[PDB]
Symmetry: D2
Amino acid sequence: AAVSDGVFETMDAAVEAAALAQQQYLLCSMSDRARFVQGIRDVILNQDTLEKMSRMAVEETGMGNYEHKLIKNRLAGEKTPGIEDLTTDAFSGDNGLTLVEYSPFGVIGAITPTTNPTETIVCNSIGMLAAGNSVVFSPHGRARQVSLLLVRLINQKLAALGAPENLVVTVEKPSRENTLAMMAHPKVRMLVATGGPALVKAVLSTGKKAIGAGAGNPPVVVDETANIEKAACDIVNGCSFDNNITCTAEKEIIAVAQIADYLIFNLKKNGAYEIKDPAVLQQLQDLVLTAKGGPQTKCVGKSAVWLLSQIGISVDASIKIILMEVPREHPFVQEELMMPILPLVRVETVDDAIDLAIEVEHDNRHTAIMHSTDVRKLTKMAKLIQTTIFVKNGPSYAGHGAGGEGYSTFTIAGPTGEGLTSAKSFARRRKCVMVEALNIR
Amino acid sequence: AVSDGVFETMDAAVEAAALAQQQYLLCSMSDRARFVQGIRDVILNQDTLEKMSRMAVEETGMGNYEHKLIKNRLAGEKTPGIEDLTTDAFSGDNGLTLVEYSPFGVIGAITPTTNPTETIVCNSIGMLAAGNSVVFSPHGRARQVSLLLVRLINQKLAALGAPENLVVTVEKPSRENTLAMMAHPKVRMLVATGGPALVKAVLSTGKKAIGAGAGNPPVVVDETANIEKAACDIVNGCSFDNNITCTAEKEIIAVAQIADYLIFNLKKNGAYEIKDPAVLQQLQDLVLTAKGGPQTKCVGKSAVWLLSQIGISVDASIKIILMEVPREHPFVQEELMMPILPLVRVETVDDAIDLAIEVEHDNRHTAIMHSTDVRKLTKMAKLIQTTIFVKNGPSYAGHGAGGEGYSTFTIAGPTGEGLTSAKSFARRRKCVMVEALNIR
Amino acid sequence: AAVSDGVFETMDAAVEAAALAQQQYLLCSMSDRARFVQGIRDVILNQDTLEKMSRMAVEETGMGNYEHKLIKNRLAGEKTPGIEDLTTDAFSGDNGLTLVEYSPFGVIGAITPTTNPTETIVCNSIGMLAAGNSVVFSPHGRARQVSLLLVRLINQKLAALGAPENLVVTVEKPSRENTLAMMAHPKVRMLVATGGPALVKAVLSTGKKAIGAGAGNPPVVVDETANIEKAACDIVNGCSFDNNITCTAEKEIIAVAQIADYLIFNLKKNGAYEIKDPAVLQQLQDLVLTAKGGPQTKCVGKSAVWLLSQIGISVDASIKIILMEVPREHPFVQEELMMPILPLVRVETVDDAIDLAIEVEHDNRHTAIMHSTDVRKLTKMAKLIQTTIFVKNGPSYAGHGAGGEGYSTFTIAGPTGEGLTSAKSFARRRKCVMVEALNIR
Amino acid sequence: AVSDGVFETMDAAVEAAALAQQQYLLCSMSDRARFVQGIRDVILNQDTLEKMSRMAVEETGMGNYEHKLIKNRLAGEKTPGIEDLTTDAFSGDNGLTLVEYSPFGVIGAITPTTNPTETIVCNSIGMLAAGNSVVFSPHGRARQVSLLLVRLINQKLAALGAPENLVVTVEKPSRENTLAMMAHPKVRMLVATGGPALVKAVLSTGKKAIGAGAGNPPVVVDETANIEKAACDIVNGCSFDNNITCTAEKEIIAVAQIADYLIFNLKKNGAYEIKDPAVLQQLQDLVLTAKGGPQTKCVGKSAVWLLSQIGISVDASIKIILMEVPREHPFVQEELMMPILPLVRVETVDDAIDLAIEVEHDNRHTAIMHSTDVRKLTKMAKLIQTTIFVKNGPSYAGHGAGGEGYSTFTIAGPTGEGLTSAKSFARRRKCVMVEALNIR
Ligand SMILES: NC(=O)c1ccc[n+]([C@@H]2O[C@H](COP(=O)([O-])OP(=O)(O)OC[C@H]3O[C@@H](n4cnc5c(N)ncnc54)[C@H](OP(=O)(O)O)[C@@H]3O)[C@@H](O)[C@H]2O)c1
Ligand SMILES: NC(=O)c1ccc[n+]([C@@H]2O[C@H](COP(=O)([O-])OP(=O)(O)OC[C@H]3O[C@@H](n4cnc5c(N)ncnc54)[C@H](OP(=O)(O)O)[C@@H]3O)[C@@H](O)[C@H]2O)c1
Ligand SMILES: NC(=O)c1ccc[n+]([C@@H]2O[C@H](COP(=O)([O-])OP(=O)(O)OC[C@H]3O[C@@H](n4cnc5c(N)ncnc54)[C@H](OP(=O)(O)O)[C@@H]3O)[C@@H](O)[C@H]2O)c1
Ligand SMILES: [K+]
Ligand SMILES: [K+]
Ligand SMILES: [K+]
Ligand SMILES: [K+]
């Protein structure tokens, strides 16, 4: 009588275990699904586990900050849709009744990132189990200890609820070699990749159904009609949240010249440290960029204080982002730093900002933000930029369900088109036609 | 001048469609509506309808003229338009949120020789309705009819002021062209309607892909069924377009107590029963290959024609060839796509369901059941987990011809989209207006 | 001085107090509504108050039993829809964006039944407050003490939650004369009536928007294809639930002759006491009927043990209903007894049973039940009888959400056509048209 | 032989509709679709369309022919058919639950002289779509045009194989006949499109009744609005059908900074501004009664007509009569239903919203606002709480002409149905299949 904890020595064993679990899960009720989904929430939302997970992940990856991981972890456990997300469509007429249902895929193989290692395990497992699947996690090696502990905790709770063993599994030695082994396993029916563009292309080359949640470079546009004070507060909060490691965070400002100066003034009131010295700006570049001009790993997810500390500047906790006005070609603008480093580009009109916001978004079709009260301008940018998420007059994280209407998720699929994934995304659509019967209108 | 939609190289076609898509983004929803209506008019024009139905059967040698008239009309009438692109909305204290269906870009579509014109009509309507351009990569066996339809569509759209090259294809449809479309960097989405090899290929391209694979639809008949009604439905669904629809019945699983009565009524409604094993081996030698798969020359041929090729002369009233064989028999396991319908006898309805899942080969495509017991209909529908499940009717009722719902000719099982429509070819986007527009 | 407890001396004072409160309620947020809705749930689902309410109702009215009010009150508190029932429809296109919302009516005047006194208040208040209304409750004289107590407990919880005073109010001495005043008070902008056919025609004659939950006479049809063992168990549970005082409970069996005997056999196994002596059946009629021929108020809602004991028959607690086979003309068939007395009419064919079920239903179009595994026959009866609720192969209370899919209500509108009332039913449909803006598809 | 739908007595019509509705229950949804379409063909037929529009203004003396063509066409094109009767479904461990829209029975509709043909066409399509029969009780003034429409409908329905008397009316429409219909026990639901007195009476008949009340729609223009676009939209919406449509603009509330520039642009789009109070006092004496309410002889007359009745000659370019009066002015406070548009100047947008609510008289019918500030647009929509709210467009954009959504000519403020359609004329029914058909 040895109950599994869900962590296996090899990827092949994890997949076979999750496959057998999926067959048994098919014999369960929707009520059973709901109890297991509620068990996952209970795990992450238990105040102790919540605090450990949040602190443990920041320590192991060095990315993010504790207080905001508490919020994001809670957001995942509280506002990830459950079985209620699996609605039913019905059409009744002379030819009978037709029902359309969301049924399970089978064994799903999920690949999680280093920025949100626990939040993405919580969100994926809740939605995938709600849809009747089993999930194999290939986590980032840099998030091994915390990712594996969370899996063990989930299995523990699920075992106490009488669930079939191994609904959620991972490997004891997370590595890229194991990810590839999962991507190649015949019994994996669907891949869900949350990471960079290189990962998204890989899973879309396996011969399997695959949801790809790629990267972005979210611009935020502030036009002359905007509540500048509010925009400044929303932009600093949105940019500095979790030290800018959320895929939706603001990562460049495109301000209309008429209001640019007053914006910068209010930015500095809300904790923005403006770098005006072109020599100090070069020190920051040397610190955060690599030879290839890309973000330096050791700096990703560090506070603005820490980053300024590294170049000999000492500031207090009130400073949340580092701010600089630079040309549109600057690397900080072009690159996805994932740091509380926020460039600002000055443009003449609101239409110029929209054009440059589309250009600098690099056609990721991911996220973009705009501050403005003119319904016409809000409509124009939203229509043109064609991003999976578009926030107006609020912090970027309002698109995640924290501050805006809608549920929350941590797998945002721009490329593959599924949008803000939920249990619906991890389900096959089925049609059931009862001919000339059950039409009782 | 103005493009007829056909190009010499695949790279030329994709580039043309890519620019048309950019131009298409400037058009209104009203423009999409007219262009969609234009495609309906092209195929619902009685003369073009008859020409396309006849020309398709002649070129591919598969199907029959009268039933192509029905399928082509279904694709043009019941394929959803821009009304399929609905808007979700949530409003509360944090303002308003909208969820919309937006364009994917340039879509490359591979279409089947069995339903060459129906798929082009169904695909393009939904794809252009979602704001996309489409590059079609037909198969060689249907080259002429597919190119004629593309040109006709480009004509009608040009008369409606549409950006040129919304629907394009190459002059020499070939396998190497398909592989080029699959690799071109401007193709944002692939849509494959065909066999398992095509669906796996398309899913190995590093692109978003919809895979509408093959099936082996079993029809289960239990002891609670209306036997003579089930006999008529089975024969109609099986022989429709000579069985080349991916959803048509292709093997019967009958409970033993009613099997003799089912066979009886099947013969009363156009089934030629084969009881002599000598003739059964003849039919196998004709329609099977050395490896054991369906013979391409026999696919899509009527029951009369097939029987003629083994010296049996019957009248037009015969629509299917029926035989009672074991479950391991080739006709059961293989997707013949012919009006040849093997029957397998089992003891109980539970054994029928178990065998129905096995014989479906995890294609998870289509299954049929005849039964009046609501508990048994529910059991089989839940367990077989196919994309379409039809109860107490012909298989084509799940296509929207005799059943509720819209119609499609690309049914995605592996990739899970179900019955593809305009929504299938769109990305979901979310628009959050923070703390405004909540007017409740 | 102190906050109102919700009870007022005159009806005018309560309508005025609710009119002011509803205006203050417009200044509240959807998040506030949710807390107020959750407050009502917390009140009735508080284990002590739950038992207290279930006990008081049965004692003060003499109808129902304690164990089953525990369930009905819990159902009303757990499965009544909240604010989430107020969806939003959107339409985007060339002409812009159209929203359709559910908005408040204002002050709602609600008349509750003596049979379901606490359950209707919980259900009505939740739905009406979720929609942004204030409710004036006009309970019947019998349920005075329990009604005022629930109203006082609601006002108490809402006050702690910071709500405006007097969102839920009633009068100190409920009476027919107070109900009439409420029905004619100008500031009352909607009437929701849960009761008999007289009350429904009254509110529909006041010159106000009125919802009318009428009476019924639910027949249960059993044909030859039905699982008879389960049918008997379900019919007994559904008929005896709360001693038959729920408006949806089975109140006459229409059995196909071929299975009528085996049905009666299993009914007896499941707690049915059959009366075969016509002299004994006569004693029951003299007890439960009036001179006019209607149900005796004294006997409404009493258990089967009680009713038998009052004609000199003692039985143990395993008896739940009194069964007798009678002609269709019998008064137990024609009358809505609201007692655990269940007649059985034998017919030849299932088409005969369907024809008779329609007749006996008396065009109430309220509730009906059928037991059958034939999909053709289930459809036939459902289409033809055209009732607001139709239940198949289960106890009648599955239409209430207790054993069936959907939410729960205790105000089922047949005449006015709103169906299973919820928050939507107490809200006005509004259209907002943004011309040529916010069409960001 | 076949009835034409017109009956001498009310009891005969209601009895005929009752019998018709019984026979209607046996018809398929396909039949309803056909009957619904048949009504669309009746009014969209160009000859009838022009006949009805012309015959209506001539008989009633209200509105004008050009705009009745648009409204009648709107009623026939954009009134939802049977597709409005959607089905909700919930499936789980406890089985399947369907929610359907079923018929009420016999509906008694009361149509206004303002929109006599439009209301009949809209109500009949929706009521027949839901599966009901309708007994129309027109007003005396529109008798001839109403009865001609009913007769054309019964003719076309009779050709389509419909049960006789799905749509009926009486030969001599009167108030006694309206009261008879209200009391008849076989009338299951009453639908009232008219003034407040009608709504109260119909809600006192002991029946289910939808009441479409009156409105006094204000239009708020604030300093963030496109003044040129606003001036053009206001004149067009106010003058449309000479202001008889219940949703049309009937008073302007303008913020002070833009009031003069708004008046300036209103005149450039067809507004004759009155500044001589002596002339205003003439208009008051013409278009009002001794009591102070609208004069029935002036309702629905063009601005050119109303101006000539006080010795002022203008050409067909003048569409409305403009004047800036204080809040208490009769024009402002009364639902004139004439192209007479008063303006009230206010200091801030907040003052305008407060006055807009005040002047709307709690009818909660219609309100319009011109602004680009998403925050201020939201504030007025949230607070005024009207059934229809239009932002940055002419009022009639709420009827579906110029805005998103379907069209209706019965707008229920008091009873809360909103923009009525086939759904509004149906009962909600729940069907519960316990522990079966849960096939997910
Ligand atoms: N749209 C969203 O929902 C979302 C959410 C969060 C983050 N992101 C984005 O993802 C990135 C987050 O950081 P990250 O470093 O953890 O992402 P990552 O660099 O792509 O790595 C994630 C996983 O992908 C593996 N991987 C990468 N390329 C692979 C390939 N060709 N073949 C097989 N496996 C491959 C990685 O192995 P290795 O360990 O060797 O790299 C790792 O296991 C950011 O770009 C962020 O914008 C997106
Ligand atoms: N799920 C759906 O929605 C759906 C719909 C329709 C069909 N299907 C499935 O599509 C499949 C239809 O098969 P399909 O053949 O039309 O498309 P396909 O199987 O995917 O591809 C067949 C093509 O390969 C070549 N080919 C096949 N056999 C050949 C042979 N003996 N010799 C030379 N070339 C050969 C031909 O191309 P060349 O022109 O180059 O010779 C032929 O057109 C069925 O399995 C059907 O069930 C699915
Ligand atoms: N569709 C639904 O949702 C629904 C729900 C529940 C009930 N119903 C139907 O409502 C009816 C039950 O309603 P109800 O019982 O609460 O009220 P009721 O039966 O309509 O009448 C009882 C109330 O009215 C007075 N009354 C009438 N007859 C009386 C009598 N013989 N003796 C003393 N008082 C009498 C009493 O008022 P005083 O207290 O002032 O004496 C009593 O409280 C049933 O017909 C039921 O089918 C429908
Ligand atoms: K950047
Ligand atoms: K086969
Ligand atoms: K009864
Ligand atoms: K006015």
